[PDB]
Amino acid sequence: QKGPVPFSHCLPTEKLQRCEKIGEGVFGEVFQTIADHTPVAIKIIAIEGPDLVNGSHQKTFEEILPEIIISKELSLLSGEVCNRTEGFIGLNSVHCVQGSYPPLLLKAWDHYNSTKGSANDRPDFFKDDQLFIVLEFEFGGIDLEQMRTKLSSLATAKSILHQLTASLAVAEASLRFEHRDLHWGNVLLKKTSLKKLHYTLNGKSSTIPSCGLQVSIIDYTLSRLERDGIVVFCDVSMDEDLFTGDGDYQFDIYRLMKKENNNRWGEYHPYSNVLWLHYLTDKMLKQMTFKTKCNTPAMKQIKRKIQEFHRTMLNFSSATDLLCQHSLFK
Ligand SMILES: O=C(Nc1ccc2n[nH]c(-c3ccncc3)c2c1)[C@@H]1CCN(CC(=O)N2CCN(c3ccc(-c4ncccn4)cc3)CC2)C1
């Protein structure tokens, strides 16, 4: 809060030199880099200026605050006691930066455009007065959608669904959280050598077999939480586009959320987390393809249990209810 800092504050030379672009959205850009031998993901969002960026207006600082707040609150659950989870992406730091875009990041941007292609404008039009928010996250891996063909088996699917359900339950209990946009691009996966992952829900600790993967939830655009009756949420009550998509169950979920909440987005309706978990379970059964099919009895029972989850879970009121009551987790 000593005013904006230069890019070099967050990205000193060596850290800048090691940046590779890994993601993007209308919001801006995501780079992976290394510092102290450890990968991090850097999300860079232009704020406060008059230029369209990627077709949209820039957010003001007041408008970017919700993202910052929610990202921090969910990250801090990894250090709490009664409601503890590491299943949200870890937030290392947030800065407000001022300057034109670093040439080294443009070099990385270009490399990505040449190899993967981009929907974004080349971010080379910013002036030396431009402000940005730079969010530094732990590196969370690769999204479930990109891993459509890369997972081992439905046992891995069960671990992912259990991890997601537990994380959402913990956040429900602590923060009256709803993610509200948990499509399969927002579930990150990375290898872990831990066999069991740990969480605590309202003071009761348990474990989840990892199947070698750690899940991290990202992207709080539409998310809602509260502390001491102060609610932070994205008011989409007047959005048209959001409720008119087609071609994927994802777009039904927006409509189903609006039905559940009567188009009142400030309220708490943890059923929305159940809807997203159902959409994810649907992806696991219908769009994911696994290296090893369920060819044995124990594996076959896992398949049947995930199908039973799919068919029953919409009769639960929250992620907390699913976690605590559903047979899949017993
Ligand atoms: O954007 C992506 N990943 C994201 C996003 C946000 C993130 N926030 N935080 C993280 C994060 C990651 C790891 N650890 C911690 C945090 C994010 C990762 C994925 C990877 C890339 N992706 C799709 C993509 O970038 N495409 C590029 C190519 N493409 C495409 C190509 C050309 C055109 C085009 N349009 C107009 C003119 C010319 N070409 C449009 C789209 C569609 C797919 C989804």
Curated annotation (Swiss-Prot):
Changing residue 245 to F: Markedly reduced affinity for histone H3 and reduced histone H3 phosphorylation. Belongs to the protein kinase superfamily. Ser/Thr protein kinase family. Haspin subfamily. ATP binds at residues 22-30, 43, 138-143, 181-186, 219-221. The gene is HASPIN. It is found in: Nucleus; Chromosome; Cytoplasm, Cytoskeleton, Spindle. The active site is at residue 181. Residues 16-330 form the Protein kinase domain. This is Serine/threonine-protein kinase haspin. Strongly expressed in testis. Also present in thymus and bone marrow and low levels observed in prostate, intestine, lung, spleen and lymph node. Expressed in fetal skin, liver, kidney and small intestine and also in proliferating but not non-proliferating cell lines. Changing residue 43 to A: Strongly reduced enzyme activity. Serine/threonine-protein kinase that phosphorylates histone H3 at 'Thr-3' (H3T3ph) during mitosis. May act through H3T3ph to both position and modulate activation of AURKB and other components of the chromosomal passenger complex (CPC) at centromeres to ensure proper chromatid cohesion, metaphase alignment and normal progression through the cell cycle. Changing residue 241 to N: Markedly reduced affinity for histone H3 and reduced histone H3 phosphorylation. Autophosphorylated on both serine and threonine residues. Strongly phosphorylated during mitosis but this does not appear to significantly affect its intrinsic kinase activity. Phosphorylation by AURKB is required for full activity toward histone H3 at 'Ser-3' in mitosis. Coiled coil: none annotated. The chain holds residues 469 to 798 of 798 of the full protein.
